[PDB]
Amino acid sequence: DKKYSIGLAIGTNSVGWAVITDEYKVPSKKFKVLGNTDRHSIKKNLIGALLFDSGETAEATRLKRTARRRYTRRKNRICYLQEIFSNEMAKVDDSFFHRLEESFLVEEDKKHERHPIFGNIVDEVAYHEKYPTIYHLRKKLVDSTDKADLRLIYLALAHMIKFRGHFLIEGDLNPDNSDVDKLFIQLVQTYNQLFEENPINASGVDAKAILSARLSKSRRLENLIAQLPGEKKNGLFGNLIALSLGLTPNFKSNFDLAEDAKLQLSKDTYDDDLDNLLAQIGDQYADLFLAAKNLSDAILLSDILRVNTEITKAPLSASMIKRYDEHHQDLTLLKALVRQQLPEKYKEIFFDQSKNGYAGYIDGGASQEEFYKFIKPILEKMDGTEELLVKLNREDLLRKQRTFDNGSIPHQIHLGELHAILRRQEDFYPFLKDNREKIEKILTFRIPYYVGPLARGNSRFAWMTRKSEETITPWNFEEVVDKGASAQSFIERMTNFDKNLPNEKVLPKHSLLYEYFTVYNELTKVKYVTEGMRKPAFLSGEQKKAIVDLLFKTNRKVTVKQLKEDYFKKIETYHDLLKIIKDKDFLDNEENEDILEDIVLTLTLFEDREMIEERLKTYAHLFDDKVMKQLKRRRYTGWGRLSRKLINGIRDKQSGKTILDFLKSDGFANRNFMQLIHDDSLTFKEDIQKAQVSGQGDSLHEHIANLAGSPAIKKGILQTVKVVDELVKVMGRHKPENIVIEMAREKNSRERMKRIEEGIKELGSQILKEHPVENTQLQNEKLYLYYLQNGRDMYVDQELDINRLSDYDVDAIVPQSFLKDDSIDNKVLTRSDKNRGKSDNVPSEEVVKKMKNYWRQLLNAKLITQRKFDNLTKAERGGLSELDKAGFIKRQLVETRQITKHVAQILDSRMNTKYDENDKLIREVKVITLKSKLVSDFRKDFQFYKVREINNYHHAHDAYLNAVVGTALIKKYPKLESEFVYGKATAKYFFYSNIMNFFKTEITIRKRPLIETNGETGEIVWDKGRDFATVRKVLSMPQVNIVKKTEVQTGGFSKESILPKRNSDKLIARKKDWDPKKYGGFDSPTVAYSVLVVAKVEKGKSKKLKSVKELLGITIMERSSFEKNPIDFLEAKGYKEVKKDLIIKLPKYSLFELENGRKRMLASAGELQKGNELALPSKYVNFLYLASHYEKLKGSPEDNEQKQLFVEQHKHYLDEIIEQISEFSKRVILADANLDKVLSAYNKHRDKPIREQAENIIHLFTLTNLGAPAAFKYFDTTIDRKRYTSTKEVLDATLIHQSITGLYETRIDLSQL
DNA sequence: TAGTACTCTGCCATCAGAGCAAGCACTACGGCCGATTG
DNA sequence: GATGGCAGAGTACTA
RNA sequence: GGCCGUAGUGCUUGCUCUGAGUUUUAGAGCUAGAAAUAGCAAGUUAAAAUAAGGCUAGUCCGUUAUCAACUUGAAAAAGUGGCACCGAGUCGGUGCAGCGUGCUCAGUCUG
DNA sequence: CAATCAGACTGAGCACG
């Protein structure tokens, strides 16, 4: 038995641990080794770390799941259409659908003719000649009036149904509205006709260009307003224009309606909102609103159709046909031009599929951007290509019909085309006449987002409820699915429970009881003071009732003057429902509170008007039709944090009064919620405690999963809990005195590009147009800041130069000393940092006044954030006060993160379990949490420098230093237990500035005593004479238990790319009947785990059985098949007489010990990884840190000078570091060619400065590392990977099974078996 | 000599968007919210 | 972003 | 620490959808050529699959989390490994074990 | 409103296995 402590450092992919005794010495004990080897014991130190791969989020899995569901539903739609057509298609050509299904088949596999539509070569060729694309067929069917072949009708309908289009725009679209100017003129005419007193003139205004601009919608509206006299924004005409172009205007000010009456044109509720507005004002604005709707349709369509729709009913098909024709003409013209001018490049342009060009554009995979990049210079270096170059510049040269930009086509266009086809062809096909509604339903149906998957009790994600047990098709979806219950369950499965009553659901935020509760809490804490009062007094129950009835039940906002006048002078959600139902006695009654709760619950739950009105039909008799309509109109959003049972259901045992009852009857006490619930005498606390006891706690893994945070952090937490338990078991089941823990704080380029594009569009500038920047270039911090600041200085009014970058200075708004935040939200790029003023405070008031307008504009442009703006304009608010500075200094050392709170609580609950007589938990184990700042400062101050590139020992060293610092600190300052152990401005500032000054011998010059004592107690907390030597000795130990957590690979079967056909055995069939050698397939499977099999194989013509020992990679696809029957799985692979007992399962990162301590880790069944750590001396580590200037220089000039001299005298340490690396590589790495290249590079770059040489030597440790080999770079010379691609040598080595700390092992010698 | 059989080296990885709902964590403020004895 | 798969060129040993 | 009021940012989980992309087949290539080969013509589209697949047969499920070895259990789970000292190139060596009960004394804590 | 002699453990000596 010995008092000991555990120090832990938690990372996303590493967890270090350390056990220390009283004198800060790490123990060392012998451990028994199990297995068949002759080694039965081994000595190890209680210091180490566990490394694992980072956890992942379920986002990719969710995306894959949704895609799978989408594909299934699409096939179901096509099957519905085929089922509709089946009888007549069997009459016409019975094998048509069979031919369609087997199109993906070689000729010998088809049981029908190869041609899929007509089945004979003449007919197929004629059809393809007449309709080169499906859009030709679609336009012909839409426009022509004669009979069409049934197969052709089905083909057009199937294309339309299979590829519908986006559902962003709701309602109906009329493609005939295409002209922008004509509809703008019509709208102006209607406006002038109605508003005769103040007519509006818009002649001479480029309405088409203004409205169809590529800028933002708000910018377009502003431009149109500026170029339009007689009105501005928020006027009637301005609101009409905004409504047409898509913004949501408030028509309240136009007619003084006093209600918002906002209308959105794309929303489904637009018709109801317009009906309400028309009933409010009058019926004479219907023409104007209809004109606005037509203008909106034209505005949104003209950007897509780009064709005249007055002659055809298929505008999209006409656009695709003209795209085809322009493609054809441009191709002919380009062929002629190339033939005439550059005959030698014709082959490489129109025949070579590898290089980009037309051949690679059509036959190859090259996209439109790549084709344009290839073909622009050739067109430029030719004559007669001006119009082709113009089309290229506007991105309209040689365009395919199916492209990426086709995603902006609403499904309403396809629906209109399909309806036109059905209307044309229903006279000749009665079945087409009959099934028109259901075919259109097939095209336009989509499952509501709140209904979810239509399961039948075998899905964990589903929540839908069926009122009838039968197959759900799009035609009886309403009559089978209980939509209201499905939506309510959709909302309720995600809402929280009350924390005080864990089995109780929370109330809606706008619930009436919630409103009364909040108002009563606010009212009971206001102490009135008036004449004739000796001391301030609290309001009584009757006074509060009178005040609530007279003020709260009358006016929305209650103020102190109103309280004094209407009650103290005159005498001495509720309002929203009052103006809707227009009933005061009903709302003030007490027997309809359940009805009111139901009403607010419905309005909160359902966002669809039909659902709200069908749910409220039960209360339709209580009110009138207009009241019901108003109730449907009103909708609330938000959920409270308190349950109804907690607020009003539970009652005190002594008095039989609920919390609301007590709050109403507070009287002179005026005790609030927190008080009511924390009172010892009151039974509310006891009842709350009783409820929380029920359920208790789930498993540790379940609790960690239920925590909120990153999955990688949760994985690290679980590993830390397990290693703590393992160490407790190791140390004899004696729990430690203290557990000191710490936790690290932690396409992006595409996000930056979209953000800058949106900001530039909003601001109306053209900085991107001046010089475009790619995402990779935008990844640079200086460039990103320059582009975010619109190319202008942020502290003074001047212009910055992009070509002059890498020369300015990046200045943080809050100085780095107070807060260490390096994010863009705190960084600012300016020409000179001195413009900000003082360097130890917020930017100066003069600069704030100068740049307030610019910063406001940037915020409105979303270039900077609200927090950034608030930080920048803090000088006006008052700047950085002394209390703020003290808080910033204090928060740099005291951990306050909820994740670390949780972690500490879990460890505390696991460790301390006993209770006293008075049910007071005994703090046997004290959990101390520190930030990384304390340990980092300790390392910098006392020359315990950390270099991350040497090896993985720094995790264990950090854990040990955490233990030492935390234990020493809580011994020296026992009063600091409040802020560290889980369980004035000037004075606070200088207290935390020197909190760690008892470690050091000298301060600022203060001669601190050699032996540090607690004071008031006889405890020695530190001894600079010998404890520093102990820490140095511990950090220089060569043995540290580093464990790579073995895992079984899970995930995708292989690479998702589908390769073309080739005669290789590595291809994987995409379907059971699709031979890879004839259809192509996947490759590169992921190996779940290797299996060691000792068996015999048939070799040679005689098929003699040769005993073989080898590793077999059980891939993810065949893992279940293997585990179901290993014998059959292995026999089918070709091995005979395998041994079930001798089969060994070998997951990833399995460790093997071969010779001279050389260790290899199993990367896969045919690859290995390095498994050895270089224990470089701390003298070499310190020299490398000092010479390399880690984190530049952060020392005094006097101290900086002596370290430079130290490096100068220790020049020769470089050769020894190289010597250590070389001998380690010779003993373990065995990469001879790479070692020779590294040594040659070192010899050739010997004359360069020590700084540069050390900086490059840091890279050489990538050669001698643990894990997968990686390529590094020494100066110019680059050294590639030396991969170990053979697992044959490990079959005679020693397989080590390491526990979670590595102290418990089971060595299995595979050579014997 | 032909045929396996193992080794070294370079290439290569599905990608973009649209809503909706619930929750947490943090920032920035701006107010209320620790017990015992006479 | 990297790290394992794969094709291809290359060299070596045995029937 | 929580609960209100406002505002903002980021992240997580779940659902309904969109456009592409790859793979095979269909869209008769021609002429001079014994043959390779050469010269022309053409190119834009569609069908099907989009993790193999599963049984629970649903317009459902299939890439998250969890997982050293051994023993006992169907499983969930529970068990399995002596200590001190001197040292340090991935851990080595040395030493001990493999004391219990009654009386007096003296020091510390509680009634 | 104002104050914040009995039981257990360790070491020392003697007796028995």
Author numbering: 2 to 573, 593 to 766, 775 to 1011, 1031 to 1051, 1057 to 1365
Copy text from the publication.
The prime editing system has two components: a prime editor composed of a Streptococcus pyogenes Cas9 nickase (nSpCas9) and an engineered Moloney murine leukaemia virus reverse transcriptase (M-MLV RT); and a prime editing guide RNA (pegRNA) with an sgRNA region and a 3′ extension region. The sgRNA region consists of a guide sequence for targeting the specific site and a scaffold for interacting with SpCas9, whereas the 3′ extension region includes a reverse transcription template (RTT) followed by a primer-binding site (PBS). In prime editing, nSpCas9 recognizes dsDNA targets at a sequence complementary to the guide segment in the sgRNA and flanked by an NGG (where N is any nucleotide) protospacer adjacent motif (PAM), and nicks the NTS. Here we present cryo-electron microscopy structures of the SpCas9–M-MLV RTΔRNaseH–pegRNA–target DNA complex in multiple states.
